Amino acid sequence: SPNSQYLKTRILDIYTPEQRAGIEKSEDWRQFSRRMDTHFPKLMNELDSVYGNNEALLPMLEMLLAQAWQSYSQRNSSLKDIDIARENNPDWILSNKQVGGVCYVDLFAGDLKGLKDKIPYFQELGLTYLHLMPLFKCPEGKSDGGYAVSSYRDVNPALGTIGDLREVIAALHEAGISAVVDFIFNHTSNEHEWAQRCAAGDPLFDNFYYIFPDRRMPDQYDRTLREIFPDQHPGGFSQLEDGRWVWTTFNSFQWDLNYSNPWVFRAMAGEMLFLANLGVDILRMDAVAFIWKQMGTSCENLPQAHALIRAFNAVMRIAAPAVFFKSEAIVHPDQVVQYIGQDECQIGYNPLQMALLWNTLATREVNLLHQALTYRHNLPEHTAWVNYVRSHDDIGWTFADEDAAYLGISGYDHRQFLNRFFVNRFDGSFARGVPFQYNPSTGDCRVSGTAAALVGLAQDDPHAVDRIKLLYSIALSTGGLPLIYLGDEVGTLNDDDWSQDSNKSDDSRWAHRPRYNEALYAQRNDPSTAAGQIYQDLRHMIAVRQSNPRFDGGRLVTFNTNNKHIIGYIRNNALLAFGNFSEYPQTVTAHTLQAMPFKAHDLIGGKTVSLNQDLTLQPYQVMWLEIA
């Protein structure tokens, strides 16, 4: 395999002798050259592990490196300053100062111009990170909410223009907010130029997707494939009008890209560089688990998938150091953590904590949550979790059956209960969610519904507001970057139009993708309303988190509370957090608290608490005690 020095001499061959001499002495070339020497070894090693002696690897690599240099040369000076800043501050993602929010531009603010006008609010809330849902062109009508991309560079006209997007990004940076967008790299819409040309037989796009003549191979693959949207189609394939079959992990109009073709990697690396130069700070790597297929396997979390992501990482280390990755892997806990690393995805969603927060509200027992925080929370240096309560997606019960069995819990029976409970098919449940993708062949099912709907705010459950406060307190204090599903801070309920919308009726996730509720947002400063109670409560916690150094970093040590309903953990050996998941008062005994300081200030309620006696927490009460 080639070396950095040799490859760089070929990159410069596009220049005449006179021009070349000037490039060699330029600052941009010096920075690029240094990064190449440092990071190229990883790029080469990762690409070699995937493609091996493929005749197309070297040509593809040289084309990619040439593009990378051109991309870096074009990169704006301001962005280059951020590149250097983060190159020397790898833990910027682990700071307690960070708090993120996510929203759909159209649903939250109408269009990109309208979103820019909401920035003052984001600053008011304390956000330093903003994830904007799919912004580029997609099919009209059904597009999996923008996740079926028809173009990676042309902005959805309904939202605005590329010009508007640049203004929004610039405005976000001006307000001290990082711009986060999706990198939908596992598949494109069936209307994307690449898809059309591949299917049409254009040799330039040969093997850009996985297309078969009949069901022979698809049938073989289906023996081991998990169904993501069983309501849409069985297995992982859809049939074209001409009779052929195509790999479609998700909707039939979403065609999986073929990374076994090195030219597909190059193509996607090019799109990544485009996003990088728009000023994006973090790319949400969508459906990372599915980017490599292999007959006889689940075609999820395969070795080459991880290698390809690390190759993409190296490209950014060389051509846009400021760009970090956020892994979106909603899979088994053992597999989730494998995507997280300084050289792969620096941050990643923490579905286990999220799923268990809801599990605990249902069961009132913190056993599973305590187990996860004890054995699956701490991560390698320079990496962090993205902790959340809700997202634009359904809730999947992705806890480990092996972990549960150790606690004497049957994963299958337990999920049956959780599903019944959250869709209000269990006596006394306070949840008002709706099922998503019930699979009668496996019995699996997920839950749709907003955070407020799931805690009982729809029917005005007196404990709803407190449940919301408790869940968010944990995402905000365990260690990692907390992400607020915008709308949750004022208790937004489910959308009640989706069910009758023919373009949404078959995807219950729309139940929890409501529009900006003008009425609730206008009540955020009124302490007598649920909206104001939730807003001030969350805003207070955000304020404490960002101003108090005891929350810095992502490590934690659990504390045995000796009360099955109370979770407890310590941050930096200075902040003791207790969370009561029971709708009844619960106590931590004086005996349990003997090693703690006699007194400690509670940052939540603002009072001094005595720890030399029984400590009783009110229903769903949360305490953040300064013990150092």
Ligand X SMILES: OC[C@H]1O[C@@H](O)[C@H](O)[C@@H](O)[C@@H]1O
Given the rule CB under 6 A, which residues bind ligand X? 144, 147, 250, 254, 286-287, 328, 363, 392-393, 413-414, 417, 562, 592, 594-595
* Residue with Cβ nearer ligand X (189 or 313): 189
- To ligand X, the closest distance from the beta carbon of 595 in angstroms equals 4
Under 8 Å CB-to-CB from 53, ≥6 apart: which residues?
A: none
Query: Is 403 among the annotated ligand-binding positions?
Result: no
Residues 470, 475, 476, 477: what is their CA dihedral angle, to the nearest 10 degrees?
90
Rounded Cα–Cα distance for residues 568 and 596 (Å): 13
Task: Name which of 144 and 191 has its Cβ closer to ligand X.
Answer: 144
Q: How far is the CB of 208 from ligand X (least distance, A)?
A: 17
Give residues with Cβ within 8 angstroms of 201, minimum separation 6.
Answer: none
Residue 286 falls in the annotated catalytic set = yes
Tell me if 393 is assigned to a ligand binding site: yes
Tokens standing for 210? 């996985």
Binding residue per annotation — 509?
yes
Catalytic residue, from 46, 106, 256, 286: name it. Answer: 286
Distance in Å, CB of 38 to ligand X, minimum: 31
Instruction: Tell me how far, at minimum, the Cβ of 251 lies from ligand X, in Å.
Output: 8
Report the residue number, 186 or 383, with the smaller CB distance to ligand X. 186
| Measured CA angle at 456 (ends 450, 460), to 5 deg | 120
Active site annotation includes 328: yes
Judge residue 45's burial from the number of C-beta atoms within 10 Å of its C-beta, 0-12 exposed, 13-18 middle, 19 or more buried. middle
437: annotated binding-site residue?
no
In the numeric block, which tokens belong to residue 592?
Answer: 């349990």
Instruction: Answer yes or no: is 427 a known binding residue.
Output: no
Where on the phi/psi map is residue 279: left (φ > 0), alpha (ψ -120 to 50), or beta? left
- Closer CB to ligand X, 227 or 537, in the complex: 227
Q: Which helix (H) or strand (E) holds 625?
A: strand 622-626
Q: Which is nearer to ligand X, 249 or 548 (CB)?
A: 249
Active-site residue, from 328, 403, 466, 488: 328
Burial string for 126-139 (b: 16+ CB within 10 Å, else e) reads bbbbbbbbbbbbbb
Query: CB of 386: closest distance to ligand X in angstroms?
Result: 13
**401 is known to lie in a ligand binding site:** no
Residue closer to ligand X (CB basis): 43 or 331: 331
- Is the four-CA dihedral 459, 507, 389, 519 of positive or negative sign? negative
| Element at 599 (helix H, strand E) | strand 599-602
Q: Where would I find the beta strands (DSSP E) of 467-614?
A: 481-485, 557-558, 566-571, 575-580, 586-588, 599-602, 608-610
219 carries a ligand binding annotation: no
Q: How far is the CB of 229 from ligand X (least distance, A)?
A: 8
* Binding site residue list for substrate: 144, 187, 254, 284, 392-393, 509
Q: Which residues are catalytic?
A: 286, 328
